[PDB]
């Protein structure tokens, strides 16, 4: 007999996660969260942990792993494993019934019998405080397969655990010294230091972490003082910053109207009563928190760019701060040193959850859903 | 003047003047190379004296060991510097209706780096002809000058 292989009957995708330091020191290595600079090349093959900013992602799309082909005159299927970025169609029928036959009849691909996988990829840029003196946050390319695929979203900090591997690329022929390789990380498991609010279910360890916080009482004043306790007093400001996070309630009228369930605040004052420290403190405590500045890029930096996407032949909108943040806090500083082109973007976003553009290739209406502090 | 260059007297010596625009890079050409057959383990040597596209010399087609059998033994070979110059007709005297024309110009050994872009010069040279991988006419060639010596106004600016 000749049979379907077990990898083509494989119901499921298999992944690994490492062992945390606790299990390394308990019973006395395996996963230092390495810097993208620290990787020193010759780790190729290893399972490694790296942490940094996921600056940019592609959209998920199918990429084929096996092509299934149909031959009528045989009835046997032909399966071609696809391994590199490219393939050539195995049009000449390889079947065991046509090999010892005069006629070598044709075959046609089946676009559902072809085993795919969900493919996505991202850059991680170096985590800035780990960059040496004078050096630059260089970047690494990560490839994803299967069920993990949406766990990476831009503008967030993650541990990636996965297997670090070569890819066949070298430059452009002359700019070469033989048998060079590109390299990528095949992602296996993800954890992220500021978590997604959308996952929040209650299990044997998280309820008691809430309950032990409550039972001391005065929780509202306990948390206000626990915000930015490294700066003096002024609790009324820091007490309101806790409300900015919890934000109130989004209301939909059930009749085609929406009103902002969100808090927008200004911290007007003179020098010396610290501001950016409170802005920075709330950027850390806010998942999806973002920090901004008065001048320079902020026109595009508060707006959708448009970009020819490196990995695949399509344009994409790239989100500035008000779009790299959403459902979360955007922090603005030196505020009045912004300009009319910045304000007339901001002024719409406090009033309502959306931005609108109508220049060049961009005509969209875009969801902000940000709190401006 | 370049305006009076003609297909008349191709490959005679020519005397002409202009401004050097640019001076490119000191590319490296052979003058002795030692060569071994990668299958015959057999050695020769080749020399070139003066010619430094469709001309000069190439490695011998074969010494069976088939085509292109030869490895250049770089560590027992001698090389020379040559340079590409461009000269254009002085913008003080050119047609009102159009841009100046120019000539590709080349020089070898000690004649390199003698001249700085923007100096005023007279060249004595061989007005010569080469084929350009254009992309020009149905069948054509491109003119160039091999400098065989050079002189100038005593120092420009």
């Amino acid at each position: 007999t000749e049979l379907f292989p077990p990898n083509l009957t494989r119901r499921y995708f298999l992944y690994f996660k490492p062992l945390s330091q606790n299990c390394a020191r308990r019973y006395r290595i395996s996963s230092k969260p390495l810097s993208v600079r620290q990787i020193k090349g010759d780790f190729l093959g290893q399972l490694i942990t790296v942490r940094g900013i996921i600056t940019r992602v592609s959209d998920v799309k199918p990429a084929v792993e096996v092509i299934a082909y149909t031959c009528d005159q045989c009835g046997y299927e032909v399966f071609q494993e696809v391994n590199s970025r490219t393939f050539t169609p195995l049009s000449e029928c390889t079947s065991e019934e046509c090999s010892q036959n005069q006629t070598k009849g044709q075959l046609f691909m089946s676009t559902r019998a072809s085993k795919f996988s969900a493919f996505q990829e991202c850059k991680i840029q170096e985590l800035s405080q780990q960059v040496p003196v004078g050096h630059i946050p260089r970047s690494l390319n990560i490839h994803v397969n299967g069920t993990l695929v949406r766990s990476l979203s831009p503008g967030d900090i993650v541990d990636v655990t996965g297997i670090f591997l070569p890819a066949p690329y070298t430059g452009f022929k002359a700019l070469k010294a033989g048998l060079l390789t590109e390299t990528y990380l095949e992602a296996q498991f993800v954890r992220q230091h500021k978590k997604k609010f959308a996952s929040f279910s209650l299990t044997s360890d998280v309820e008691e972490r809430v309950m032990e916080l409550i039972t001391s009482g005065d929780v509202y004043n306990r948390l206000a003082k626990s915000i930015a306790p490294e700066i003096y007093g002024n609790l009324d400001v820091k007490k309101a910053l806790l409300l900015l996070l919890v934000g109130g309630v989004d209301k939909r009228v059930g009749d085609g109207m929406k009103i902002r369930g969100d808090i927008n605040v200004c911290l007007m004052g003179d020098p010396g009563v610290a501001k950016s420290q409170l802005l920075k403190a709330i950027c850390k405590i806010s998942p999806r928190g973002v920090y901004t500045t008065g001048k320079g890029s902020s026109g595009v930096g508060l707006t959708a760019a448009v970009m020819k996407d490196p990995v695949t032949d399509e344009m994409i909108l790239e989100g500035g701060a008000l779009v790299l943040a959403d459902n979360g806090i955007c922090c603005i500083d030196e505020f009045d040193k912004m300009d009319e082109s910045d304000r007339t973007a901001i002024h719409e976003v406090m009033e309502q959850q959306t931005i609108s553009i109508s220049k060049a290739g961009i005509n969209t209406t875009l969801n902000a859903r940000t709190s401006i502090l | 003047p370049l305006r009076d260059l003609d297909s008349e007297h191709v490959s005679k010596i020519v005397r002409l003047s202009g401004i050097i625009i640019s001076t490119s890079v000191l590319s490296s050409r052979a003058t002795y190379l030692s060569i071994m057959c990668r299958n015959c383990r057999h050695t020769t040597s080749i020399t070139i004296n003066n010619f430094n596209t469709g001309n000069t010399v190439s490695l011998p087609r074969s010494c069976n060991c088939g085509p292109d059998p030869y490895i250049i033994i770089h560590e027992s070979s001698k090389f020379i510097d040559q340079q590409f110059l461009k000269l254009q007709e002085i913008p003080e005297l050119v047609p009102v209706g159009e841009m100046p024309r120019n000539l590709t110009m080349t020089c070898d050994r000690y004649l390199t780096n003698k001249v700085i872009p923007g100096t005023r010069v007279t060249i004595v040279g061989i007005y010569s002809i080469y084929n350009s991988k254009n992309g020009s006419g149905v069948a054509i060639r491109t003119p160039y000058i091999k400098i065989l010596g050079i002189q100038s106004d005593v120092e420009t600016s």
């Binding site: 190729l44 700019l175 | 590319s27 090389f79």
Partner: protein, 105 residues
């Protein structure tokens, strides 16, 4: 071309996807060994330069060690061998001469 100073006879060996006997193979990535390649391009120091002229620059290849100890804009001294490798023009077909570079030691 970059592992010996002498022009060793080239050995364009083929990556083995099948055994001498004909069997399949798989790759033991990380029992295999690797090394860092880098090239850095050095142009003349601008205060010694006879100013007004264009910059002129040459390509330096670094093996595994020194890769970490250069960055753009710093003043750097290199030592090495100014090899003139390949065979442009005289082999293959057609001009521009040999690829010249320094092996940084």
């Amino acid at each position: 071309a970059t592992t010996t100073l002498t022009t060793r006879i080239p050995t364009p060996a083929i990556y083995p996807t099948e055994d001498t006997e004909g069997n399949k193979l798989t790759t033991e990535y990380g029992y295999s060994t690797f090394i860092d390649h880098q090239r850095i391009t050095v142009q003349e120091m601008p205060e010694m330069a006879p100013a007004g002229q264009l910059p002129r620059s040459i390509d330096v290849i670094l093996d595994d060690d020194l890769v970490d100890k250069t960055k753009p804009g710093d003043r750097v001294n290199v030592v090495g061998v100014f090899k003139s490798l390949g065979a442009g023009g005289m082999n293959q077909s057609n001009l521009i001469g040999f690829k010249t570079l320094i092996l940084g030691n």
